[PDB]
């Protein structure tokens, strides 16, 4: 065996360029960390490899648990931590595997997709698959991006509500907007300020900056632009106080009517027509029953529950699964699952099922954040939308938004059919 | 090398008890699947091991992709698929690793927790950690479960709105409620029907069944009980038509005022007091600035955005990270992140920061679904709440809800301090 | 002519029992008021008649206007001010005439009503009349009161959120509720506390007391009961601070999801079936067009606008007109107009139009407040619901609520037909 | 006495130019109406005077009532019906007197107003008066109009959601908007189309036209412009179906988040600062208590109730009273009472009370509708805003909106002080 060497030593070895770590033992590193000679947060750099750093962190953590063996089945080895450090997570102690299933082919805008879904919910993928099959037999779905821009809603404060009114008026003129647009756009090549939306509350002024952001989701870029624009605004109104760069007016990761009404990120609509025969044989129901259930659940039931933007069956399921599979920020599902599902009779006999899904606030990107990790990049690649689209910036993010809407629609179709048919 | 054998053969080998798979090659299985002799969804059972089944599925999928090499960095090997089959996912082609960091210790109700957070969002864990530290220096946090029961909101339809009124009246009497409660409770040992909430819309009657469910999240159990109760109800009103077992009146996985006002799952409140000195040194701000930002962002900004239940900074971040780490259904964050954050001055000098978070609709469990997988069980175990609590059923789920609320509060504290301090 | 006498005199005459007012002139009273010898608010008592007091007030006001002749066409004479003083208005300077039309007969629950509507909106009464005619030809409407109780939502505050939780738990037990119910019910013969609804936010506890109130609208009585109950509650928790007797949790005269979901005042549903032929000849449209418009305006359009409880065409018009005619508090229309209108196909051929209106928060009374004035009492009397119903307390208020719902439904029918038919 | 003459006769007299009505008796007219020889709706024209026509209508109505004497105290005589016929009401049977009190002087934007309030709610005027006094002692209030335009939200339908997207895109271009603006503006001199707001839901397109309308409230003018613009739009997309001229997307007379977020009619902010001493002596409270109550009632209590736009104490009371006094459409209070009230500490010592009211959707006019009647014109005249302002069109409506906001603020101040002080 062996025993730890004193603390005063073991820094000699740590320092030595040749005789570095890989000569110390785990217990020795533990001792050095417990003595404050190393900061634990740095263990992945000050250590021969990154995996060993997370190992050390795990051992330290285990010592403080009531059940020391808790981490046994949390996997941490043979994972590329270099892409996570300083980018994606801190105090890393391993990774959480989420099973990934595949729904498809989804026939959307004359193409076919195979949609990865990371879920632990049994039967979700199978239900989505049945919906995909129904749509495919129906002659495919169609989608359109209606609007596109990520937003940031800072709140600033003036000495008096009259001053706030003055600032609002100045922002509404062409000259003031031009100045703010120039300041905002100077911060990046994709920063192209669109029309501003202001709201006063007493001496608080809430300003909603909106802009396209290439293929990135846009939060960092929009925030940077917002900060620069607010500095410029401060130049004209030195009494202005920037209270918060986010005033919950964006609105980011909270339910808000503003996202529903004005949009946030990408606004999409998708539609399909399902023949009567296909509704009978694949969905095991009828068009009339589907419409009845749609009206009395997604419209009237949501209305009685007091829903804003929740006029759908389970869009959040599909959205969350895809988001986790493709490296999106999963909290954003809060806003991104806003959807209204409509079903009607169609065809020369009113026997076919027309269905449409409308999702005004799909917050999504294919560059930056979680999309920088290879496993998530794989799921993006199987869709054909990985990374930046050099020719037509933002095209990959738009395509991913369309696929999200189409998959949500297939899921709606399937779950609605199941509810209408009974058990 | 070798070449595939005919299709008529290769079923002989597949059938043979001794000379089964493990004698066929990958190309041979591919051929059999393409000929419809095997259903692909069954590949994980009709194959020597489960891993090989997912391998076959992956190869089939790769053939249909525009970039055949897309799956290269999607990991699938050395993962226990036995627990996922028939429970958690279908058409499995691997798993998605989510980095797991640790925030803590969180000092909550006189105990210390180490909270796992699965995220790809940089700096989230560090910010939560700073909040945890502030709370810890402040003398710890306190929490209470206020209400507990999962809900299912079926919609039924009567011939006339007068009939719907009759059914509603009958449900409101002690005898009718007793009959329905007996029918509902007969379906499981944890099914204990609480008071019903009805809403009429014309001839549609929406009924919200609520009940505790042990340590499970409860959806399956509540749905089963609801179905039995609806059959019983049909016995008294044979003209009733059960339109959908879910009428969006639960409300499950959609923003709804009903969850905010009546609660869903567990309702929790947490609070702490942060000394002025700690607010200065750890949070790098002052109590007055924190209160100003809290009022003008979480209350007024959310009000101007038209938020229902979104009166907080970023509760969805913390909720989503914990949910993914601990095997919860992540779509449920849609409802579970509803929170209101309040900050006030406190102490003999009004210099200390009182903070409270209130979350009325935390949907959460520690048994069933994603909590059946070992990696997620590890994260549950490091909290001390894994599985069913035999002595006091539901205690582990309640504890997990308390920890969720406390972590959300630490996150609020940190992010609010950052916004108040500026860059 | 004549000239004012000194100020020191003119109080002699004012004081004298025999030689009182009616001997002073208008200018003399004006002088006394301007000298502070009389308070203007008392002019209607310290004056030979009430009309003369309002006359004096009018002259005083006229002197301070930029156009002294402004009041010329504001009528004030031959009106009974005795019933308004100390009850209904202060600083009275006349009355505002609102034209009153009559819609009907409305065939409701096998009876016929003639509904007075006080409006200045052209064509409202005629449109309501056409709707009434359609309903009448359709075999009349049917209605039910589903729930009944006015509410008051005080807010109280505890030292800590844990204390608030304790109070909430205590209110939820049978013993605590019994004590509170006794205290509340002791304050009047109609005060019968129903189940309480609580909501915590940090250390704020919001309590919604609900109760029937006879035939009165109930606000005064409910408030009195609430105050008594809060005193009783304070006895058990001496640290409780009653922050406000109304915490906007009632919710009174503001849009709130709580009124929509839980009800406030009376909850009513009304329905009718309109034969296809009648829809063609009276409404000048078809059933299919009516349903299409109903779905895509009252459901989907309201959903896209982010409406809570506004799933109807113009219920506020009818509600406001009736309320003003019948002496109701017209501000209450804010909550009382919440309505959802549903239309469906019906009959053996799906050719007839089924319509239903559901209004969960009709706040209404037939005693107290504006219902104490004779002109408003006349409008109540032509409906047959004036004053208290001695046999069956609250029956007149319930009947008035039913009539309101039925008239709203007729208005919906007519306006929807007009919109569907085009110009 | 006398007896009715046959029916065949009595039309001779009715017809005769010289020997017309005024020779027939009331019973004779009754007989002619009952025989269908006269339509009752025309009684006010085919009769010597208008008053006599309403008299005849009253007698007819009385015959059909269960209590024939119901109309006795409903006044109808000595009222100018000429201005109501064909403009304001139909089937008129009299008028409803509403007592009118006066609150003021209100010191607003360096001027003084005397605000008429038509109410039957006891103590409302006195409370508003106390608020006015506090504001006056505080150095007056200040207000600003932030935005101004009435809206109409038609809904149109396309064959497919892709077609709806095409129409939306075309409306968003400068050329399409120019064409629509020209068509819309051609219909009146005040019709000046501002930027359009569209929302898709499947194949439904909801278009929100907004425009200033002079001093009129604007509904009729905006509707006319909308119809013309929709015809023009139909020229480019012949497959478009105009489903309804109002799709509840305006949104008119329903609670909707869209009015809160985008505004409707006039958006106003008012503010004042109340010295500490004045808060003590007039309001009988302290600044700290006022702020506490404001936060925990108007913000947190409204949030817990799930309010959109109802973050105030009782703005609907003031709004309704003024609207009824000044001839406004009182149903519009539903949208016009949306308000947020904010209170803060202010001054060199944080002892003074800053208060602000923000009302984004004040729907109001001073021409047309109820403002055409002399009694309502009197109330408009005492404010100085009656009729059209020839120099600066719309200035009178803007001034009236400012006064409404200021009066609401005084009412908030008073009621909040009363709640904070207790009984
Ligand atoms: C798998 C999933 C889509 C599903 C199905 C289904 O379609 N099965 C499927 C599987 C394989 C192939 C084909 C179909 C059934 C489902 C529904 C009806 C009949 C059978 C299954 C349900 C489900 C919905 C509500 C319940 F109460 C219980 C279960 N669920 C769960 C949905 C749930 O998470 C969200 C939802 O509850 C939100 C809401 O409605 O408020
Ligand atoms: C890491 C995270 C909590 C964070 C911090 C922070 O506290 N940094 C931190 C990291 C390590 C240690 C200590 C602190 C800052 C943050 C905030 C202000 C100053 C510095 C960092 C932000 C963030 C918030 C809004 C922005 F526009 C940009 C960034 N964010 C991102 C929050 C975002 O996801 C949700 C939020 O936007 C929702 C909303 O407010 O509407
Ligand atoms: C008289 C009233 C009911 C009416 C009619 C009608 O039915 N006319 C009637 C009169 C006499 C006999 C029979 C019928 C028409 C109406 C509607 C369509 C065609 C003809 C008249 C409208 C009206 C509605 C929206 C407009 F833009 C313009 C006018 N209005 C005004 C309604 C308005 O106040 C509220 C509403 O706008 C709320 C909303 O929809 O958002
Ligand atoms: C007269 C009115 C403004 C008033 C006062 C007041 O200020 N009195 C006044 C009169 C004369 C001079 C000075 C002051 C008191 C009032 C409040 C507290 C103490 C004394 C009176 C109340 C009132 C409010 C809620 C209650 F439960 C009961 C009464 N009310 C009735 C308000 C009510 O309609 C709307 C409100 O309830 C909406 C809400 O809060 O949800």
PDB file of C-alpha atoms and ligand atoms in Angstrom, chain A residues 121-131 282 297-298 312-315 317-318 411-423, chain B residues 90 151-154 217 219-220 222-224 226-227 244-254 264 329 331-332, ligand 1:
ATOM      1  CA  UNK A 121     -41.846   8.838 -20.628  1.00  0.00           C
ATOM      2  CA  UNK A 122     -43.076   5.450 -21.846  1.00  0.00           C
ATOM      3  CA  UNK A 123     -45.063   5.385 -25.088  1.00  0.00           C
ATOM      4  CA  UNK A 124     -44.347   9.003 -26.039  1.00  0.00           C
ATOM      5  CA  UNK A 125     -42.161   8.013 -28.989  1.00  0.00           C
ATOM      6  CA  UNK A 126     -44.575   5.331 -30.171  1.00  0.00           C
ATOM      7  CA  UNK A 127     -47.515   7.779 -30.065  1.00  0.00           C
ATOM      8  CA  UNK A 128     -45.524  10.401 -31.961  1.00  0.00           C
ATOM      9  CA  UNK A 129     -44.625   7.682 -34.483  1.00  0.00           C
ATOM     10  CA  UNK A 130     -48.258   6.822 -35.078  1.00  0.00           C
ATOM     11  CA  UNK A 131     -48.992  10.487 -35.654  1.00  0.00           C
ATOM     12  CA  UNK A 282     -54.426   4.323 -38.425  1.00  0.00           C
ATOM     13  CA  UNK A 297     -60.626  19.874 -24.719  1.00  0.00           C
ATOM     14  CA  UNK A 298     -58.071  22.144 -26.403  1.00  0.00           C
ATOM     15  CA  UNK A 312     -53.174  22.087 -27.064  1.00  0.00           C
ATOM     16  CA  UNK A 313     -52.966  18.510 -25.807  1.00  0.00           C
ATOM     17  CA  UNK A 314     -49.273  17.904 -24.943  1.00  0.00           C
ATOM     18  CA  UNK A 315     -46.975  20.078 -27.060  1.00  0.00           C
ATOM     19  CA  UNK A 317     -43.861  16.610 -24.226  1.00  0.00           C
ATOM     20  CA  UNK A 318     -42.609  16.744 -27.809  1.00  0.00           C
ATOM     21  CA  UNK A 411     -47.983  14.148 -31.373  1.00  0.00           C
ATOM     22  CA  UNK A 412     -51.218  16.140 -31.097  1.00  0.00           C
ATOM     23  CA  UNK A 413     -52.807  14.011 -33.799  1.00  0.00           C
ATOM     24  CA  UNK A 414     -51.895  10.758 -32.067  1.00  0.00           C
ATOM     25  CA  UNK A 415     -52.799  11.720 -28.490  1.00  0.00           C
ATOM     26  CA  UNK A 416     -56.068  13.324 -29.593  1.00  0.00           C
ATOM     27  CA  UNK A 417     -57.004  10.168 -31.493  1.00  0.00           C
ATOM     28  CA  UNK A 418     -56.226   8.051 -28.419  1.00  0.00           C
ATOM     29  CA  UNK A 419     -58.388  10.291 -26.178  1.00  0.00           C
ATOM     30  CA  UNK A 420     -61.245  10.329 -28.693  1.00  0.00           C
ATOM     31  CA  UNK A 421     -61.221   6.548 -29.180  1.00  0.00           C
ATOM     32  CA  UNK A 422     -61.182   5.804 -25.429  1.00  0.00           C
ATOM     33  CA  UNK A 423     -59.316   2.778 -24.079  1.00  0.00           C
TER      34      UNK A 423
ATOM     35  CA  UNK B  90     -39.221   3.155 -27.730  1.00  0.00           C
ATOM     36  CA  UNK B 151     -55.079  15.974 -10.278  1.00  0.00           C
ATOM     37  CA  UNK B 152     -56.814  14.704 -13.406  1.00  0.00           C
ATOM     38  CA  UNK B 153     -59.448  16.891 -15.155  1.00  0.00           C
ATOM     39  CA  UNK B 154     -61.761  14.719 -17.316  1.00  0.00           C
ATOM     40  CA  UNK B 217     -45.824  11.412  -9.208  1.00  0.00           C
ATOM     41  CA  UNK B 219     -50.541  10.515 -13.104  1.00  0.00           C
ATOM     42  CA  UNK B 220     -51.072   6.836 -13.895  1.00  0.00           C
ATOM     43  CA  UNK B 222     -54.923   9.201 -10.633  1.00  0.00           C
ATOM     44  CA  UNK B 223     -55.987   8.376 -14.209  1.00  0.00           C
ATOM     45  CA  UNK B 224     -56.904   4.820 -13.233  1.00  0.00           C
ATOM     46  CA  UNK B 226     -60.612   8.685 -12.485  1.00  0.00           C
ATOM     47  CA  UNK B 227     -61.661   6.061 -15.012  1.00  0.00           C
ATOM     48  CA  UNK B 244     -62.069  12.691 -22.689  1.00  0.00           C
ATOM     49  CA  UNK B 245     -60.323  11.367 -19.609  1.00  0.00           C
ATOM     50  CA  UNK B 246     -58.308  14.576 -19.762  1.00  0.00           C
ATOM     51  CA  UNK B 247     -60.201  17.774 -20.633  1.00  0.00           C
ATOM     52  CA  UNK B 248     -57.224  20.093 -20.022  1.00  0.00           C
ATOM     53  CA  UNK B 249     -58.816  20.829 -16.684  1.00  0.00           C
ATOM     54  CA  UNK B 250     -56.055  19.105 -14.623  1.00  0.00           C
ATOM     55  CA  UNK B 251     -54.120  20.972 -15.976  1.00  0.00           C
ATOM     56  CA  UNK B 252     -51.204  18.835 -17.090  1.00  0.00           C
ATOM     57  CA  UNK B 253     -48.201  20.322 -18.950  1.00  0.00           C
ATOM     58  CA  UNK B 254     -49.821  23.573 -20.042  1.00  0.00           C
ATOM     59  CA  UNK B 264     -51.347  20.775  -8.401  1.00  0.00           C
ATOM     60  CA  UNK B 329     -40.737  14.161 -16.377  1.00  0.00           C
ATOM     61  CA  UNK B 331     -42.105  18.592 -19.639  1.00  0.00           C
ATOM     62  CA  UNK B 332     -43.795  19.033 -16.247  1.00  0.00           C
TER      63      UNK B 332
HETATM   64  C1  LIG E   1     -47.998   8.427 -24.741  1.00  0.00           C
HETATM   65  C2  LIG E   1     -48.840   9.687 -24.518  1.00  0.00           C
HETATM   66  C3  LIG E   1     -48.889  10.563 -25.780  1.00  0.00           C
HETATM   67  C4  LIG E   1     -50.213   9.298 -24.017  1.00  0.00           C
HETATM   68  C5  LIG E   1     -51.230   8.580 -24.636  1.00  0.00           C
HETATM   69  C6  LIG E   1     -51.129   7.990 -25.975  1.00  0.00           C
HETATM   70  O1  LIG E   1     -51.405   8.658 -26.973  1.00  0.00           O
HETATM   71  N1  LIG E   1     -50.778   6.708 -26.020  1.00  0.00           N
HETATM   72  C7  LIG E   1     -50.315   6.012 -27.149  1.00  0.00           C
HETATM   73  C8  LIG E   1     -49.230   5.194 -26.883  1.00  0.00           C
HETATM   74  C9  LIG E   1     -48.716   4.399 -27.900  1.00  0.00           C
HETATM   75  C10 LIG E   1     -49.269   4.422 -29.159  1.00  0.00           C
HETATM   76  C11 LIG E   1     -50.352   5.230 -29.417  1.00  0.00           C
HETATM   77  C12 LIG E   1     -50.887   6.028 -28.414  1.00  0.00           C
HETATM   78  C13 LIG E   1     -52.294   8.460 -23.678  1.00  0.00           C
HETATM   79  C14 LIG E   1     -53.626   7.856 -23.939  1.00  0.00           C
HETATM   80  C15 LIG E   1     -54.831   8.567 -23.908  1.00  0.00           C
HETATM   81  C16 LIG E   1     -56.045   7.922 -24.016  1.00  0.00           C
HETATM   82  C17 LIG E   1     -56.096   6.566 -24.216  1.00  0.00           C
HETATM   83  C18 LIG E   1     -54.927   5.838 -24.216  1.00  0.00           C
HETATM   84  C19 LIG E   1     -53.704   6.473 -24.052  1.00  0.00           C
HETATM   85  C20 LIG E   1     -51.985   9.259 -22.592  1.00  0.00           C
HETATM   86  C21 LIG E   1     -52.780   9.651 -21.406  1.00  0.00           C
HETATM   87  C22 LIG E   1     -53.490  10.868 -21.369  1.00  0.00           C
HETATM   88  C23 LIG E   1     -54.237  11.226 -20.258  1.00  0.00           C
HETATM   89  C24 LIG E   1     -54.358  10.300 -19.247  1.00  0.00           C
HETATM   90  F1  LIG E   1     -55.052  10.613 -18.127  1.00  0.00           F
HETATM   91  C25 LIG E   1     -53.754   9.072 -19.284  1.00  0.00           C
HETATM   92  C26 LIG E   1     -52.975   8.744 -20.368  1.00  0.00           C
HETATM   93  N2  LIG E   1     -50.711   9.776 -22.792  1.00  0.00           N
HETATM   94  C27 LIG E   1     -49.998  10.595 -21.807  1.00  0.00           C
HETATM   95  C28 LIG E   1     -50.043  12.074 -22.137  1.00  0.00           C
HETATM   96  C29 LIG E   1     -49.568  12.962 -21.018  1.00  0.00           C
HETATM   97  O2  LIG E   1     -48.147  12.807 -20.828  1.00  0.00           O
HETATM   98  C30 LIG E   1     -49.902  14.438 -21.272  1.00  0.00           C
HETATM   99  C31 LIG E   1     -51.394  14.759 -21.225  1.00  0.00           C
HETATM  100  O3  LIG E   1     -51.957  14.102 -20.115  1.00  0.00           O
HETATM  101  C32 LIG E   1     -51.745  16.227 -21.113  1.00  0.00           C
HETATM  102  C33 LIG E   1     -53.256  16.398 -20.992  1.00  0.00           C
HETATM  103  O4  LIG E   1     -53.984  15.758 -21.781  1.00  0.00           O
HETATM  104  O5  LIG E   1     -53.704  17.184 -20.088  1.00  0.00           O
END
